[PDB]
Structures are given as C-alpha cells and as structure tokens.
C-alpha cells in the first residue's frame, strides 16, 4: 500500500490534471493543431477532436482520470465545448495553486470560486442576445438559420463545400418545420426523434426529410410485394423459429432417412407458423430476431412482405406511428394487435433497395434520407449535418445566444474585477483569480491564428473599456474585429453555461482531495 | 505510452518524412539508380519503381507512414507520377523546415503553400498545349501516338526494340479506334474495359484485338465441340455438384454394397443436373466455380461445350455481349436466360488451346490477345504494352500536354516569383518558398544525367529568360536543349496535376500536426 | 574563460542580486532579526544593520558585488536607508523576472520603470508636509524636535535611556542654534563641522556644546602652563626635530667621547629652534607630526604649552577661528603667523585631562563634549547622539517631512494603479508591476511584529480607501493604525527619495547587462 503526504498529494494531483490540460490546448481552436494517436496494434489516427484524444490514450494518475471523467460526462452535450472545458479547467487549477502557495486554506478558495460562478450565472442572461420565437413560422426569409449552418460548417473544417452547405441549410429548414413550441420560448424538438439514413452514390442534393418511416433494409425476398396499398403490419419480438423442448431428441446419423425426418419435422412447424400469420391477414411483417429461409419462401408464396433485423429503436417508432402492438411469438399473433400504413413500398435509393412506410396515424419521429458519393464524402457529409443539427437544436431548445470570439469572458473579467473590490477578507483574492482566469481563455485563440497573443489581449481590453461587449478576435479572420454580431459569431448560451459548470466542478474537486492511498 | 513534445514532434516528423524522400530520390528518372531490397523471409528484389520500393520496405516512424499513404493513394491512379510525387513532397518539406527555423507559425505556411498552389492550377492549362480530339481519326499517319509509344518506351527501357515498338504502336492504334467518345474532347473507353491475355510462343506480331471476349480456360474433354456456330450460351454462378443436408448421412464400410449404392445415388443427382442443361438446348455452358467429373463426361456425351473456372469480370462482359443471364444454379435455370454468339471456337495460340467467343452484339469491353516468345520476354512486352496504354489513356481523357525537362516547373518559378512580389507580409516568404521548391525539382535531373547541377540551372534559367515556355534538360539525351518539344519531352497533364496535388496534400498534412502519442 | 548565453546570464545575475536581498530582509526594520557573522580569523560579530552585514561578509557573484556598491554609496549619505535600500532592489527584480518570463524585451521594461519613477518624484512633493521654516525662533518650547529625537531613539533602542534622551534633546537644541538660514527656509548645518569628544568617568548630565574648539588630548608636559591667557598660538606642520643633512656623518663606537658630542649637536639645534619660537613670544604651539622630548623640556622652561597629534580637520577649524597661519617648519617660524585666543586651558573631564581653545574670532565649527560612565556605555551614548543629530540634519536641510509606517508606499501603489490606466502599450504593463512591487514593502514589517501579512494588507487597503491619507502599519506599536502622524512616525523626505533613487538604479543596472565573460 503506497502512501502520499499532504501538501505533496495536492501538488501531484494538480500536475496530472494540469499536464492533461496543457497537452489538449495546442488543439483548442477552430484551426487547432491535430494530434496523432498510435495504438499498440499500431494503427495511426489523426484528429483534432478532444473527446477522441482522451478516449484514445492511456491515463492512469487518479487526478488525470477525474479530468477525463469530467470530459466524458460533458461529451454527450457538446463536441467543441468539451475541448474548451478541459482547457478552462486547467487554467483555474494553476491560479488556485498560487493562492495555496501563499499558505491560504483551499476551503476559502473553494468558497470564493463558488461566489464567482454564481455572480457569472446572473450576468449571462443580461449579457445574452434574444431572438424571435418565430420569424414568420420560424424559418422565413431564411437569415438566422442560414448563418448558423454557414458558420458552424466554417468553424468545424472550412475548405470548399458550398453545394453541401445549401443542402444542409435545406435539411435544417425541414427539421425547423417539425418543431412544436414551448410557452417559455424554447421548443419540443428532439434529436432523438430525428433519424438519419445514408445510402451510397451520386448527389447530396437528392437528400430529403420524411414524415413517415424509412427502413434501410433491402427486405428478404425479391418475390415479396414491391408496393403494398393499405397495409396491415404485424410486429413480432422473437425469431421465426421452431418452439421445442430444450433437451434434444437423438437419432442415428447412420440412418439416412431419420436426419431428413428431424429436418422435415422442424420445417412443417415453420409452415404452420406462416399460415397462422396469413390467417391473421397481415400484409407486411417485422421479425426482430430472425426469419428462416424456408419460412421466407412460405411468406412470399402467401404474398406477405417480410422484414428481418429492424432494431429496437426503429420498432418503437413504427409501433407508435402506425398504432401496432408488439407481439411476442407467432402462436401469440392475434388480429387486432396489427398497425396500419397507407402503403409500404420498396424504392431504390442510389441503386440500392429501401422500404418507405407512410400514411402514419401519428409519427412524432421523422426520418432524413441522405444519398451521396462514395464513403468518405458520405460519412463526412453525415457528420457535417450532425454538427449543423446540433446547433439548431441548441437555439431551438433555448432562444438565447451570446457573442463569441472572446467577448463574454472579457466582460466577466471586468465586472468580476469590480465585484472583487466590494468583497471582504480572503474571499476577494480568490474571486479576482477567477476573474483573471476568464482573461486566460480568448488570447490563446489569437496565437492559434498566428498573431501575437498579448498585444491582441490588451487592444481588446481598451476596446472593451471605451466601447462595449461588441469587440472580439476571430481565428478565421486572423484579426481583432469591431463587432462580433456582424461576422456571424454568436454562440448558443448552453456551450458557455456547461463549460463553466464542468470547469468549476473539475477544479474544485482536485482542490477538495488532501490524500491518496494506493494498493 | 511514449509521449513527445509539441514543436519538438514537428521537426522529428519532417525529418522522418524528409529522410525517406532523400533516400528514394537517387532512383528518380530514366537513369536513376536501382535499389536492392531484401525481405524478412530472405527474398531479394532489385527494382527502381518508387511505389514498389515503398510497398516492399518496412516503414515505422508515423510521419514517414503518412507519406507512404500518399504514395499508396496515388499508386491506384498512376505508376510513374507516384515515383516523382514522393520526392516532390521532400522538396516542399525542406523549404517549410527553414520557415519553421525562422519561427513563422504553420497556419501561415499552410495558407501560403495554398495560395501558391491555387495560382499554379490556373498557370498549368495556359502552360499546356492542346493537340486534337480526332480530326481525320486520332492515329492516322500515326504521328502524335507514335511519339508517345516511342517516348514511353525510351523512358521505361532505353535499349533496342524497334521491331517491338512498331507492334506496340499498332496495338495502340487498334485500341484508340474503340473510343466511345465523350463531349468536349473526352473519351470513355478505359483500362477496366481493356483485357490483355498473353500466350507463349513465336512472335509478338501475332497479337490481335478482339471485339468479342477471349476465354483462357480450356474446353475440358476432347470429346466436347471445339467449334460452335450460332452458339446458345448458358452462364452459371454455382458449382455443378451434389447439394445435400447439413448433418451428413452414413453408410458403413463393412456393408460394402451399400456404400457403392450411396455413391451411384449421388451420380444420379449429377447426371440429372447435366440432362437439365441438355434439355434447355444450350450448346455451350459455363460454370464459374466448377463442373463435376461425371458431369463433364455427360456434357461431352451430349455434344455440349462446357467451360470451367471463369472469373467474375470476364463473365459480366460475356453476359452483356451475348445478352445472357448469370443464372444462380442448375435449379434456377429456365428457358429465357440463354445468350447468343455467331460462333465460339477453340483456337490454338503457340500450339496451346484458347476459347474465343465472338459475333456478339453491343460490347464496350475489348480483349487484346498477345502471343509470343517464352515467358520473361512476354511478361516484359505485356508490361511495355500496359505503359503505352497508360500514356495513351492520359492523352485520351484530356488532350492536353505540358513540356517536360523542367519547362513547366522553371516557368512556374518565375511566374510565382512575381505573384509572391504582389503579396505583402511574411506570407510572401511563404509563396516564394513554394516557387523555390519547383526550381528544386529539375536540376537533379541534370545530375542524374552526369552533369554539374548549378551551372545546368544557370544555363536553363538563361534560355528560359530570353525565350518563353521552351528549353529543358533530358536524362535520355544527357544534355540541356533549346527545343524540349522537339526531342519529344512533353508530358500528359494528369501526371503533373496529380503529383503536385499529392505533394501539397502530404506536406500540408505533416505541418498541421503537433502531437504523436504511442502505445 | 567562461562565457554565458543571452537571457540565461541575465537570469543568473538576477538570481544572485535576489538572494542577497531576500537574505538582508530578515534583518529589516527596528524589530528585525539580527545576524551572526564569523570571520576567517574566527572573529564573532552580531549585528542587524544592513550596511554592516554586506561589509563583514564576502559576496562573490559580480551582479551581487554591484549591489554592495549601490549599498556602500548610500551608506555615506544615510544610516537607516541603506538597510531598506537592499531589500527594495530585490523586490523590483523579482517582478522584472516575471515580465522577462512574459517575453518582454528589457528596453521596454527599463523605459516603463523610468516613467514610473518620474511619476513617483512628482508624487513625493504632494504627499510631503512642511511644518514651518522657523518654529517660533527654532527649538522653542521644543515640541517637533523633541519628538524626532525621542522617536529616533525609540526606533534605535526601545529600553531605558530617558535621562540620556533629555540630554540628547539639549544637544540637538544646541546644534539648532548653530544652523544658518536658507531662502528656501531650510537651514545650512553640516556634520563635517560637528565634533563630539567622549571621556569616561562621570555622568551624562555634564555634557555641553562648546562654541570654540576642544582638544581631546592630555597635551604633553605638565610643566608648561596649564592655563594660558591671551594665547599666541603657533601652528606647525612638521616634527620638532633635527634638520641635519641626509648624507650624513658617521662616528666610531671606540672613540667613546666623540659619540656623546654627536648626541649633544642634535640636541643643540632643537634647543635653538625652541628658543626661536620663544623669541617670537609664542604661548601655545601645535606641532602636528611631533615634539622631541628635549624640545618639550626647553619649551616648558620658556613657559610655552605645546601640543602634539592635532589632526588636519581639527587644524582647519582652529586656523579659520584664531586668524593663525599654518607654518611649514620651525626654520620658517616667523612672528606674525601666530593666532590669538582669549584663553587656552586645561579642564578635567571624568578626571581625565582635556584642553579647550576659546575666544575665537568667528568659528563656524562647534564641539560637543560627552561625559558618561564606562566604555561601552559611552560609545553607545555617542552612537545615540549621532543618530539623533543625523535625523536633525535631515529635517533642517530640507524643510519637507513625510509620513511613515508604509504610508507613502501604499499611496504610490494606488496612485500608480491609476497612472497606469492613462498609459498604453507594453510600458503600461511594466509600470503596473512596479507599482505592485511598492506594495511588497510594508507588510513584511507587520510579520516581524507577529501579525498576518495578507490580513494586515486588506485592512490597510480598505482603510486607505474609505479613509484617507496618513494610514499605516506601526511595527513599534504592532498594529494597523489610522493617522500615523499621531504616533509620531514622520520621516525626512530625503530617506524615501534616496531609497527609491538607489533601488531603481541597481535594478536598471542588472537589466542593462546582457553578458558576463569571466576569466
């Protein structure tokens, strides 16, 4: 059992967490420097994604494991902020450590950072920008929605891709149509209710939203109906497979006719099962855990359109949208538990076959069909719609946006270095370190762009002093910019709010740990 | 888990990828020096193709694995450009490396190589000379084609074969007619529609084009037809073989009659299979994964010509030209699925048998039969034919040529060093280091030819300075030359355009990376 | 020969001058911890003066030697400031090392300290207080002068000496009469004209100012007048000694009588010289490099009081006051080169003999006579008189006084962190780190007294802000206190002005020096 002294243990934990942070920080910006990641299997992986470098690397120091655990817990809400969140966490820790070095109790530092964060959450709804809950059915004369998709695409990659951007703006318009509203000013839109299916080949301009369901399956037998009109769809949980007692009958393999007599006995049990489904009057069937080949001939003969591996999430929606009820087993199929579609057809997308389900009693869920060239251009175009889907769902589910390019932070740093003056003993030194820590974000972006960082930090400060919140620095420009609102660089409120929660959580947690005992 | 520092890693990853390049460049061009490559298993291989030397050699340090990935991707498109492209990537990395020593942020270098490159792509169709689409047919009084077929042979070889060259020039002529032409000086007949079969024995002059398809896999038994007139061809995917249950029926060895009856029951399943075919009335039959021995005897008894092991691609052409169906299995065969040939014969090439299907409506794919010599002299003559088809294909899909021997590069270097003047700031040093790198190609050619390089540059610069888009150095000649068109040293555009595309890709990617993390 | 790198060399010369300062600071202020210093010859020495601790110790590194030279030069003007001055140089330097770490060029840091210092100089007349220029006929009902002498003893001692302190107050009152009036409203008075003579074997109460001069000496032979009335004083540069030629006669040991006759010739020239002085009619004579015993026997016979060893400074104060002429040698003694005194007498002080010259036309110089007990208690009563006289000569030669207890410093730091708002660029950044360095003085005095420094700085910072100027921290009381004037902790303007002058000199000097080449 490995022991560690106090003083020493906190310094040793600030260093691991701090080593992770300054290592992620070459990759912080929207042109940030890409990492190279070799596995023990020796495959190389080059990315600028920050949630991917924590997952891909051996980390073992317990305080470095806490900081990835914070990143991971953050990784489900955001892709860029979870990068920014680790950098911020690291910059708070190296200021806390300077107060501990003046022998100041960490308890007080924790309490003065708690009052800082708290002041900050009452300044960001006033420092925020409020847009319309509905620009003429929330999407007309396009404006806002186009800038979020042109911006998010430029920030995540840049290069060439205008004929991709316009299609992505049309998709984003189609999701915006879906949307039904909350009396606050948010919306009841949901990523989860959105489902995106990608098919190989041709043009990205041929991608569309669907109100009903698309099944990406190619559907089992060529002889089954290629259109069904007024379809009664049965959904069944189990395999279409024989039901038999567990302990298994034995015949000799040294008699020929009996190997055929087990095989034919199980095969007349399947032909019974298919007759029960054609007696039920089903025109389509879904079976989630498989259909035998003999049974697929008998379903095709009786004229029934059968689907295999339709995954649990897609079934819940098909149930819910056509009014089915999930049936456990083929004896258990029963004639009013069947749901209903106007039609079910097979349609080719990019030469490949595909089943589109429509005429649906309620589909809350929607489907987007994405057709396009190759694999790298298709995977990348899906990813790109994803980044654009997620910015739209953050402005839809909360109407407030805040300016970016170092703005928000510089204002907290000046109101907090005004707050911290009215504050009393030993609490004021902690608070004024948290005001400086927001000032340590912002300038690093200007160094990423190839420009001096310290003269860019002072000139934003004096612009912030004579003017107001407007000013900032743009990595994509390479320069200080008069007015951030002008270059489209508004950000969702939720990318700030979460990284100030997860940086103040990771740093207060490394401050709160005075000992470490290891087996 | 091996860690490495930022800034430190960028230099180590340029060195590694610069070292690879600097080892391969002595093998560049038509006198370049050969490497010897010994495998782990001990196999020695002496070569000077550059895509082959990276395939055959172990590479371990990740930034030299990246340049190999650039080689790899270019090797799918060209065989000649890939040798050049790896060296080019070295000449760009060593000007970038000096800019990193002057402390100029990579974001700027990345962007200046980019502005230099964007200018170059708009200088290379104005530097290009465009010949003809096909006024009076392409190859008539042969000339331009004869020049590429003699010029490719000079590069790829440089020894006697005047009596090989007239034959290659003739084969090229034959291919060139086919064409299937595309708008605005394009063409559609290509490498994946060209098929070359080489058969031993006698002269290369006996080589021919075929409009139909040529099958190398022999007609089987002697007692089958060796010529079919007005042939009914059946095409079949599956093996002609006995199909039977999973768990395998057993009849004891110590009942010796009943094993013999089990065998003859399986011979009655085979003779049935053949008798179905003979009932369909297919005078020819093909089975892709095989014909049974009994089954080959019955097809011969009935007077049916059967072919075995024919490859997926050859089958598709044979489908398309005879109007046939690829049938799944003897059970799937049914009486509208048969194609049609005016004749089918077995014809002897250097004594040996070969099956030619011909008189086939509407084929786009062609077959070239190359007869000749024993074996080493025939594999080199097929290879020589390939090399001549690839120049003829770079000329067919764009009828654009660019002067070689350093003419396009020395001309981009002066036009970029004029462009780089009109650009301001430290980004002008960046444009001007990419003009310096093209001028770093070219003089290396003069040293490989056994001449002083720096004095050859000054002679080349002065003829390039008093005239315009002319003069070069030629490794074959072993001099400098006023008239570089005139000695036939001109290149198709697609070998330039790609190797300058794949050197900027590789070098731009090796710059963006600041970390390397290894398990 | 050892060489050193740029920036490295500079950091090492900042490290040596830092270690000196932060070691000299444990002795700071009047509660300061004393050092013990043992010499190479083993001599033990205990002191807390900083100009002594640098003298009694070997300091090796050249940049630390430079700082002793800045201390040596400052010790010659003040005995309190030079201690404070070492500490002030280290505290500016450790802020400079942070700016150098910010990658700021020294030329910009030097120019911002120059602008901080010129701003500081226009701030020290505004903070400055002028009491009077003449104070009811000066030292009258004494009050202000009583307080500076009692305070200077209380900082210098802090134990029983009340009945010396009162004597010291009479002596300061006596020196004040002397002081002559400048039209600035200052007073000309000079330490080079103040003289104190200490005799063992009494009580302090019997100490006096004298207008005329005191000769400390016992004055040679008792046989001469021990009181002279209307004294004609001869002053003589040389020895009363033979003038015989250097290339000189010799005499044999065995010619016994001629040896006695050479001895009597050197005594008969000395007796002529003495008779020559006596014909001139002199009554006192001073010979500064000596009196022969024969010349003393003969000078007492003529009723003449001769003095030996009267040093060159004392000799000028006696010349100017008696209207004498310093004569070179007895041959040059001549009758009107004599000065005149009303009387010259011997008076017994502490039972010890002492000679007083008085009735002097126009002396500027004064003499203070110091009686006391023992030897150690007399040297200390001398030292106590010294330091208080030194505090009078600084209040008298400039009529400006300033507050103490870290009042001036806390006030410069806040006015500069307002100056620095009207300044721009990287020289603003440098001004604001100097301002911070003044804030680092002050709180260390509260730690010598046992208080908490960060809590004594927050209570002073809020009291200096909500209250108003003359706020400080008293190390002798042990408190933060408002109106430090009340406590009597007012200093001369010249002890602050100089200690900022010499610190800003040492720190600029170690900053202008790039290299160090050492043999």
Short mmCIF file of N, CA, C and O in Angstrom, two decimals, chain A residues 424-461:
data_model
loop_
_atom_site.label_atom_id
_atom_site.label_comp_id
_atom_site.label_asym_id
_atom_site.label_seq_id
_atom_site.Cartn_x
_atom_site.Cartn_y
_atom_site.Cartn_z
N UNK A 424 -15.05 41.34 0.96
CA UNK A 424 -14.25 41.42 2.20
C UNK A 424 -13.10 40.44 2.22
O UNK A 424 -12.61 39.97 1.20
N UNK A 425 -12.52 40.09 3.39
CA UNK A 425 -11.24 39.42 3.61
C UNK A 425 -11.05 38.03 2.99
O UNK A 425 -11.93 37.24 3.29
N UNK A 426 -9.99 37.71 2.24
CA UNK A 426 -9.53 36.39 1.69
C UNK A 426 -10.42 35.74 0.71
O UNK A 426 -10.02 34.94 -0.13
N UNK A 427 -11.75 36.14 0.72
CA UNK A 427 -12.64 35.89 -0.33
C UNK A 427 -12.41 36.72 -1.55
O UNK A 427 -12.76 36.44 -2.68
N UNK A 428 -11.80 37.89 -1.44
CA UNK A 428 -11.61 38.80 -2.57
C UNK A 428 -10.44 38.33 -3.39
O UNK A 428 -10.43 38.43 -4.64
N UNK A 429 -9.40 37.72 -2.78
CA UNK A 429 -8.24 37.24 -3.52
C UNK A 429 -8.62 36.07 -4.34
O UNK A 429 -8.20 36.03 -5.51
N UNK A 430 -9.48 35.22 -3.79
CA UNK A 430 -9.97 34.09 -4.69
C UNK A 430 -10.80 34.55 -5.88
O UNK A 430 -10.57 34.17 -7.04
N UNK A 431 -11.70 35.47 -5.62
CA UNK A 431 -12.56 35.98 -6.68
C UNK A 431 -11.87 36.69 -7.88
O UNK A 431 -12.15 36.49 -9.06
N UNK A 432 -10.89 37.52 -7.54
CA UNK A 432 -10.06 38.21 -8.52
C UNK A 432 -9.10 37.27 -9.31
O UNK A 432 -8.69 37.56 -10.38
N UNK A 433 -8.87 36.02 -8.78
CA UNK A 433 -8.18 34.99 -9.54
C UNK A 433 -9.09 34.29 -10.47
O UNK A 433 -8.77 33.94 -11.61
N UNK A 434 -10.33 34.17 -10.16
CA UNK A 434 -11.27 33.64 -11.08
C UNK A 434 -11.61 34.58 -12.21
O UNK A 434 -11.70 34.20 -13.36
N UNK A 435 -11.55 35.94 -11.94
CA UNK A 435 -11.71 36.99 -12.97
C UNK A 435 -10.57 37.05 -13.94
O UNK A 435 -10.74 36.99 -15.18
N UNK A 436 -9.34 36.92 -13.51
CA UNK A 436 -8.18 36.71 -14.33
C UNK A 436 -8.28 35.34 -15.13
O UNK A 436 -7.83 35.28 -16.23
N UNK A 437 -8.84 34.23 -14.58
CA UNK A 437 -8.86 33.02 -15.30
C UNK A 437 -9.70 33.05 -16.58
O UNK A 437 -9.24 32.52 -17.58
N UNK A 438 -10.85 33.72 -16.56
CA UNK A 438 -11.57 34.04 -17.83
C UNK A 438 -10.77 34.84 -18.88
O UNK A 438 -10.75 34.54 -20.07
N UNK A 439 -9.93 35.82 -18.46
CA UNK A 439 -8.92 36.51 -19.25
C UNK A 439 -7.81 35.66 -19.78
O UNK A 439 -7.01 36.11 -20.56
N UNK A 440 -7.61 34.42 -19.27
CA UNK A 440 -6.61 33.47 -19.78
C UNK A 440 -7.08 32.62 -20.89
O UNK A 440 -6.30 31.97 -21.59
N UNK A 441 -8.40 32.54 -21.15
CA UNK A 441 -9.12 31.99 -22.29
C UNK A 441 -9.02 33.05 -23.49
O UNK A 441 -8.10 33.84 -23.32
N UNK A 442 -9.44 33.00 -24.79
CA UNK A 442 -9.53 34.29 -25.56
C UNK A 442 -8.29 34.77 -26.36
O UNK A 442 -8.36 34.88 -27.55
N UNK A 443 -7.18 34.91 -25.71
CA UNK A 443 -5.91 35.30 -26.33
C UNK A 443 -5.10 34.21 -26.99
O UNK A 443 -4.20 34.41 -27.84
N UNK A 444 -5.43 32.99 -26.59
CA UNK A 444 -4.73 31.79 -26.97
C UNK A 444 -5.25 31.50 -28.40
O UNK A 444 -4.55 31.05 -29.28
N UNK A 445 -6.53 31.92 -28.63
CA UNK A 445 -7.10 31.87 -29.92
C UNK A 445 -6.31 32.78 -30.90
O UNK A 445 -6.19 32.32 -32.06
N UNK A 446 -5.87 33.94 -30.51
CA UNK A 446 -5.18 34.82 -31.38
C UNK A 446 -3.75 34.27 -31.71
O UNK A 446 -3.24 34.53 -32.83
N UNK A 447 -3.17 33.47 -30.77
CA UNK A 447 -1.89 32.86 -31.02
C UNK A 447 -2.04 31.67 -31.96
O UNK A 447 -1.17 31.45 -32.84
N UNK A 448 -3.18 30.93 -31.82
CA UNK A 448 -3.53 29.81 -32.74
C UNK A 448 -3.55 30.25 -34.21
O UNK A 448 -3.10 29.60 -35.14
N UNK A 449 -4.09 31.48 -34.47
CA UNK A 449 -4.24 32.23 -35.77
C UNK A 449 -2.93 32.80 -36.25
O UNK A 449 -2.93 33.37 -37.31
N UNK A 450 -1.85 32.71 -35.51
CA UNK A 450 -0.59 33.22 -35.94
C UNK A 450 -0.29 34.64 -35.67
O UNK A 450 0.51 35.23 -36.37
N UNK A 451 -0.88 35.29 -34.67
CA UNK A 451 -0.79 36.70 -34.37
C UNK A 451 -0.29 36.86 -32.96
O UNK A 451 -0.41 35.87 -32.21
N UNK A 452 0.30 37.96 -32.50
CA UNK A 452 0.84 37.95 -31.12
C UNK A 452 -0.35 37.84 -30.19
O UNK A 452 -1.32 38.55 -30.33
N UNK A 453 -0.35 37.03 -29.17
CA UNK A 453 -1.41 37.00 -28.24
C UNK A 453 -1.45 38.13 -27.28
O UNK A 453 -2.61 38.60 -27.05
N UNK A 454 -0.38 38.64 -26.55
CA UNK A 454 -0.53 39.70 -25.56
C UNK A 454 -0.96 41.07 -26.04
O UNK A 454 -1.77 41.73 -25.38
N UNK A 455 -0.53 41.57 -27.27
CA UNK A 455 -0.99 42.84 -27.76
C UNK A 455 -2.41 42.82 -28.24
O UNK A 455 -3.17 43.78 -28.15
N UNK A 456 -2.85 41.62 -28.68
CA UNK A 456 -4.22 41.37 -29.04
C UNK A 456 -5.10 41.34 -27.76
O UNK A 456 -6.16 41.98 -27.79
N UNK A 457 -4.66 40.83 -26.62
CA UNK A 457 -5.39 40.89 -25.34
C UNK A 457 -5.54 42.28 -24.76
O UNK A 457 -6.62 42.74 -24.39
N UNK A 458 -4.51 43.09 -24.80
CA UNK A 458 -4.65 44.47 -24.36
C UNK A 458 -5.55 45.39 -25.24
O UNK A 458 -6.19 46.23 -24.73
N UNK A 459 -5.55 45.19 -26.60
CA UNK A 459 -6.22 46.07 -27.51
C UNK A 459 -7.72 45.67 -27.43
O UNK A 459 -8.60 46.55 -27.41
N UNK A 460 -8.10 44.38 -27.12
CA UNK A 460 -9.45 44.01 -26.91
C UNK A 460 -9.92 44.59 -25.58
O UNK A 460 -11.02 45.15 -25.48
N UNK A 461 -9.03 44.59 -24.60
CA UNK A 461 -9.38 45.21 -23.30
C UNK A 461 -9.75 46.79 -23.30
O UNK A 461 -10.77 47.27 -22.81
#
